[PDB]
Structure 1
């Protein structure tokens, strides 16, 4: 069973940084001891602590990080994605609008697929979207993901620790309800990060905090100002039509937002123009 990784064939190279609920590292996997082996990414895990594994095991698509197996405190083993996160990539290269849109498209494809499998992500930001060699998008960090039971539209969870509240729709900040439409909001914020080249001083927490204290006063204030209709600003050099898309992803009421399935055509259309 090539889903079962043996400690004895796993040799560490680099730390790769941190995901939600565990460190990630690059390992060589050399079961036949051939001196070359295979590069893999391993996340060290550990109620619902194994949910990341259970969810990702069941996902297969070109725009989601590929599950490889586990090592029996548990280790999750995934494809290594060499270029890393969009958040560290974009500030360090010049990238064309047409290509930022293409990255946007691919996030939507994967998110549409994820939604079709009845999962929500709840952690969609540029820091968690990774790039492979051909600059293909792979969505990552499934630490916060949940299954939405059949014929329900949301899931209720109060996170005990940190979560990307600056990426979260009002219904999530206020009532701890997470809809499919909530990931669409997050994707709107993510679309903003791409267009601001993930400049740190343009970043959502940067911009939101400008308009604003304590950890949870911040959240109540942020909720208040989203409900009043205030939003991140148009990125410099961002086309009008694209700003419209983001604005649509940030409708206050979740039923107004477009779906990822809706977004694919629209992004394809704007990708040429």
Structure 2
């Protein structure tokens, strides 16, 4: 089944022109689309209804939309609406013109500490909003931490997300395999908000070190290292940053910081956080003083 050249909404009679191809997310394909009337450009997620025939996939799609449409925060990908024809489901999302932290990490590898801190603070602010709205993402990775023109982080891809119905509710079932598998998900012990802090722990490590904390050449060794909490922080990592990674990457979920305690860590409160990053930071490391002061030209 071919994808339509123009995407028409039965209800609001809104019509979008299928522009540049952006990429595919497993089962879904993503295109740059523009409203023919207003000329406003969006990120169109397009899922073949042929691949939703399995009821367990319809649950996943409906749950993703239900969660994403209820969210509105400057560090969460905007949800502008959804619709369907008889062949495809169309989801209209905020366009983040600088792709995601995955593309940045592939080009730059290890970031400077101020860059890491700049990105991580926004990731935590976004996740804080989710957790306060009783949402667990359960699949935070570089690839779904999107970047807009101003290099502001936007959390997207709620494909594995669940809503907590009461305070201390623990979940078992996932409709897919998270990128950063927390030890309580691997052991099938039940999980809550703490999985998001684990993945933020893996993300922080990757940004500062330039490679993942657990990932090896084979998944069998990868998952054994996660089970036994076997990872090594290079001595070149600063003591405050090293400390915060150790807090987040703990086997005991109750031992990890909450998202509120995470934001109030010395790493953020006592560390230099740039107000802006120059656009050159996508490809080349920026200059920072040993002791940056807001009393300087």
Give TM-score, length-normalised by structure 2. Answer: 0.76
CA RMSD, aligned part only? 2.4
Shift of 1:154: 2.3
* CA displacement 1:192-229 (0-9 Å, x = unmatched): 121134xxxx235xx5325x6xx6xx2xx544433433
Q: Does residue 1:99 correspond to 2:115, yes or no?
A: yes
Following TM superposition, the consecutive aligned residue runs of length 4 or more in structure 1 with deviations greater than 4 angstroms are 4-7
Q: Which residue of 2 aligns with 1:31?
A: 37
* CA displacement 1:11-43 (0-9 Å, x = unmatched): 1112211235422111111235xxxx0110011
| Alpha-carbon distance change, 52 to 6 in structure 1, aligned in 2, over 3 angstroms | farther
Q: Which residue of 1 aligns with 2:20?
A: 14
Shift of 1:238: 2.5
Secondary structure class of the residue paired with 2:115:
helix
How many matched pairs? Answer: 249
Q: Which residue of 1 aligns with 2:205?
A: 192
Q: Does residue 1:156 correspond to 2:172, yes or no?
A: yes
Structure 1 residue ranges without an equivalent (≥5): none
Alignment map for 1:52-71 (pairs within 5 Å) = 52-71=64-83
Looking at structure 2, the residues matched to 193 and 225 of structure 1 have their Cα atoms a distance apart, in angstroms, of 16
Secondary structure class of the residue paired with 1:134:
coil
Q: Which residue of 1 aligns with 2:186?
A: 173
| Alpha-carbon distance change, 5 to 38 in structure 1, aligned in 2, over 3 angstroms | farther
Secondary structure class of the residue paired with 2:271:
helix
Q: Which residue of 2 aligns with 1:226?
A: 226
Contact 1:98 1:271 in 2 (8 A): yes
Q: Which residue of 2 aligns with 1:208?
A: 215
Shift of 1:102: 1.2
| Alpha-carbon distance change, 26 to 229 in structure 1, aligned in 2, over 3 angstroms | same
Looking at structure 2, the residues matched to 125 and 156 of structure 1 have their Cα atoms a distance apart, in angstroms, of 20
| Alpha-carbon distance change, 196 to 87 in structure 1, aligned in 2, over 3 angstroms | farther
* CA displacement 1:65-90 (0-9 Å, x = unmatched): 01111133421111100001101023
Moved more, 246-255 or 235-244: 235-244
Shift of 1:237: 4.0
Larger fraction in helix: 1
Looking at structure 1, the residues matched to 13 and 46 of structure 2 have their Cα atoms a distance apart, in angstroms, of 14
Q: Does residue 1:119 correspond to 2:125, yes or no?
A: no
Q: Which residue of 1 aligns with 2:94?
A: 79
Secondary structure class of the residue paired with 1:209:
coil
Contact 2:186 2:227 in 1 (8 A): no
Shift of 1:118: 0.5
Looking at structure 2, the residues matched to 223 and 152 of structure 1 have their Cα atoms a distance apart, in angstroms, of 27
Give TM-score, length-normalised by structure 1. Answer: 0.82
Larger CA Rg, structure 1 vs 2: 2
Shift of 1:247: 1.3
Looking at structure 2, the residues matched to 258 and 127 of structure 1 have their Cα atoms a distance apart, in angstroms, of 24
